[PDB]
Paper text:
Recently, a unique binding site for a cyclic 12-residue peptide was discovered within a cavity formed by the light and heavy chains of the cetuximab Fab domain. Here, multiple crystal structures of meditope peptides incorporating different cyclization strategies bound to the central cavity of the cetuximab Fab domain are presented. Collectively, the structural and kinetic data presented here indicate that small perturbations introduced by different cyclization strategies can significantly affect the affinity of the meditope–Fab complex.
Next, we sought to directly probe the importance of van der Waals interactions. Firstly, we replaced Cys1 with mercaptopropionic acid. We speculate that the increased atomic radius of the S atoms is responsible for the favorable hydrophobic interaction with Val9 and Ile10 of cetuximab Fab. As expected, the affinity decreased with increasing distance between the linker and the Fab (Cys-Cys > MPT-Cys > AHA ≃ β-Ala-β-Ala > Gly-Gly > linear peptide), underscoring the importance of van der Waals interactions in this region.
Author numbering:
A (entry chain A): 1 to 212
B (entry chain B): 1 to 132, 139 to 220
C (entry chain F): 1 to 12
Amino acid sequence: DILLTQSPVILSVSPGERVSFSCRASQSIGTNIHWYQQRTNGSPRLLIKYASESISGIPSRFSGSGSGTDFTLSINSVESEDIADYYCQQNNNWPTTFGAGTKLELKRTVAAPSVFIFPPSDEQLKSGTASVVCLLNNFYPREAKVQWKVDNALQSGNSQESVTEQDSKDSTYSLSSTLTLSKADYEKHKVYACEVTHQGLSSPVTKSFNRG
Amino acid sequence: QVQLKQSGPGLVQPSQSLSITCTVSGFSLTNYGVHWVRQSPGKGLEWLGVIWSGGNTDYNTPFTSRLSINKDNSKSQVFFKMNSLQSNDTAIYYCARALTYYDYEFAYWGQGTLVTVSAASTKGPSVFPLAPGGTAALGCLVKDYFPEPVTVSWNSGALTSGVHTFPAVLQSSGLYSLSSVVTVPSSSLGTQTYICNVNHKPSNTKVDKRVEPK
Amino acid sequence: XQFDLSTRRLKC
Ligand SMILES: *[C@@H]1O[C@H](CO)[C@@H](O)[C@H](O)[C@H]1NC(C)=O
């Protein structure tokens, strides 16, 4: 089968900038290449067919060139809604094969997180488990530290983080940190604190509550 | 419009078979081919096979033995079946239609069916509330379900601005957990109702959780 | 990068 090599793996640019994706084929495939966009939780969307032919409904800022083994998808002025992965596909040789894709990331100005903390619901406590959630909302860039403390004791190993993909509108991330305790441990302690460290804060921000 | 609507996401036991139905509209199955493509961590996008207007089938080489594609033109339905799944067959499966009847440029896709190959049992989630400069945050903790995915929306789709639904994470228990938040004006907590609509299709668990200030 | 089933996005 034809191997398709896309590069780079990650592309980082700023809005309004031109950007280019590369796709190299393991042997000449003429102009038989198609390009796709995939957004968070999406199916692939066809952007360009046969190297350069345009697609109805696709913003004119998308174009492609190339022939033989070296192909290029271009975005002339990058928008925030372009945050996505991009894939090439060859169909000169059966079977049709796809590249491994390029991830597009957008730089923006530093944005401090808004921090919210949520104690476990009494409904969940009936089940014998306590989840304490800490929310870091709409920040940039992605690096952040969440540190949990219960009654001045540092928590380690009992929390998990999930981070959204980049927002398609404001280009920020959001993060949740969930501290999971047994109901017994939770009932034994009082002060639940989450300390958040990020580049957009001049000092760390703590949100906390006292059980009851 | 041209559309492809696939059957719901679900568990398949190791060495059992996977079955997906693609129902199409805005075109006739007698005029177009329907292709099947999958998307896995280990191999990315692979083309699997196709059934043509006239009923002929082509299967990609690694799948000739275990793949079968059928259809019912009158019902606008395409039937995908794959035998003896192993764990690296866990993937997102898609049906798709080309721009022209004989070609392979996929302009129309189904929403994809997330397929999990595992010997585990299906389990619906519990839903718990995450209770709330004039901006309040509130949400839903969607906990202890298998397999992926859950859909979550807010106020039956009417609330979308400010909504963040986090990627699910696998707990040590082997069950997933996820939170969905939204930010709103705190002055609106008095007058608006907030409900997260949780849907876990693999277990047919549908919950609407009202989230109030405690 | 690698495709992530939860988000359908590449993840490094
Ligand atoms: C799964 O395993 C088989 C046998 O090791 C291999 O041929 C195939 O490439 C694997 N599939 C994926 C999607 O990684």
